[PDB]
Ligand binder design. Structure first.
Ligand SMILES: CCOc1ccccc1N1CCNCC1
Length: 435
């Protein structure tokens, strides 16, 4: 696997031991061969699990998620997928790693797709090796892969709203359930219903994931209500998954605005990863997978692959060359390669809007490419009337950094800045000049 120009898809089924058994063997071999190696974890939670899998191997944990004292001599680095792409974009030295290992390599956040594009391009140039670890490579059509123990698969109507009757099977269960919902707001409504029925519920989403995931270890629970973030190596002591089989798809309309379309069907890869939360213990056969819809290839025209092109157009590779998306997922976007390349100062603005600004990639790009500087928030208030953002059925208002109360009405409207209360609070802080 470790030879130059080799990209290996380590596609063992979910729970087959890719992270805990195979990865430490790869790392031992890499160190013996003096290969400068990077290991990419999708989340801080997985970074900390990897330290346990790799204990007593000389690895530099480029994350505050791991409490370790480095020797200073490590030739293996571990960081998050997002950290890798972030450091490529910034004026910071990133080693040309001989071996590039991506764990949970199916992750479809923009920074993960961009990282696969960069790594697979360096391999194709003949510079590097890569290992992509996932049960569900891009374009997999199998929602029901093999497991450590037999799963009971049942197609059934799954509630997506509060219910009073007609779903007794949901609450009659005495075990632990992981329930995948299409959005934070949908999970809130289902969580409230379950809580009202006397169940202990933990809610997970991207922003809350590290803090709330610890509650799955520290407290007794009946249900975990999660968005698709739990597709990325989240492990639970569960015996049932309830899967809406639904997700939100960010869609760019008319090059002008981003909407959160759907909910609509998940991909096969997503469904297999959701199911893959259970069936993991060979001594516990008959974990249950209840699924409420079919799969479709909803990644086609999904904004994350356009956003991945915005990131890759702004990463130095060699002279004016630009990394291609990883071939199996390259048809998910219609972009002109290089169309999003920014000059040095606009790139710096673009990076700062994503990092400190915490804006979606697409929205950061519209602002930076318009020649607006990071702290200039005039654009948050000068959009068209249909761009008015709502809070409790009235226009959302902030006090500007000038001390003027203004309606939130961004010149470029991205539905992800107000898809839930937390997002809207963050965007209101931004529009007010508070970060
Ligand atoms: C932004 C944090 O990234 C780093 C970058 C390089 C090496 C180590 C670290 N940290 C991680 C946090 N503190 C421990 C070591």
């Amino acid at each position: 696997m470790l030879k130059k120009k080799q990209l290996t898809v380590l596609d063992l089924h979910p729970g087959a031991g890719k992270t805990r058994r195979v990865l430490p063997e790869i790392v031992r071999e890499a160190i013996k061969k003096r290969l400068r190696t990077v290991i990419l974890a999708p989340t801080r939670v997985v970074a900390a699990e990897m330290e346990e899998a790799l204990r007593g191997l000389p690895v530099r944990y480029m994350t505050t998620a791991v409490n370790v004292t480095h020797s200073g001599t490590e030739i293996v680095d571990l960081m998050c997928h997002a950290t890798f792409t972030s450091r490529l974009l910034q004026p910071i030295r990133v080693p040309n790693y001989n071996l590039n290992i991506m764990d949970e390599a199916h992750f479809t956040d923009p920074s993960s797709i961009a990282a696969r594009g960069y790594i697979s391009t360096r391999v194709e140039m003949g510079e590097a090796a890569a290992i992509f670890m996932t049960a569900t490579p891009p374009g997999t059509r199998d929602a029901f892969p093999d497991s450590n123990s037999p799963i009971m698969d049942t197609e059934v109507e799954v509630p997506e709203r509060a219910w009073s009757s007609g779903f007794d099977w949901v609450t009659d269960h005495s075990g632990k359930t992981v329930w995948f919902v299409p959005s934070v707001r949908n999970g809130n409504e289902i969580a409230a219903c379950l809580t009202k029925a006397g169940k202990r519920v933990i809610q997970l989403s991207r922003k809350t994931f590290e803090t709330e995931f610890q509650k799955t270890k520290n407290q007794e629970w009946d249900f975990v209500i999660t968005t698709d973030i739990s597709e990325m190596g989240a492990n639970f002591k569960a015996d049932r998954v309830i899967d809406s089989r639904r997700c939100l798809k960010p869609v760019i309309l008319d090059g002008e605005r981003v909407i959160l379309a759907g909910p609509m069907p998940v991909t096969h890869a997503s469904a297999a990863q959701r199911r893959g939360r259970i069936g993991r213990n060979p001594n516990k056969p008959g974990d249950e997978y209840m699924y409420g819809g079919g799969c479709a290839e909803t990644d086609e025209g999904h904004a994350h692959w356009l956003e991945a092109r915005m990131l890759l157009d702004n990463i130095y590779l060699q002279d004016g060359l630009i990394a291609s998306l990883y071939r199996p997922e390259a048809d998910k976007v219609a972009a002109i390669e290089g169309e999003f390349k920014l000059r040095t100062e606009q790139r710096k603005t673009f990076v700062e809007l994503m990092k400190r600004g915490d804006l979606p990639v697409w929205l950061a790009y519209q602002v930076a490419s318009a020649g607006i500087t990071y702290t200039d928030r005039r654009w948050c208030f000068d959009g068209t009337t249909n761009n008015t953002i709502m809070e409790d059925s009235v226009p959302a208002e902030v006090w500007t950094k000038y001390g003027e109360k203004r309606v939130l009405k961004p010149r470029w409207m991205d539905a992800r800045v107000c898809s839930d209360h937390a997002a809207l609070k963050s965007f209101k802080e931004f529009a007010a000049g508070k970060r």
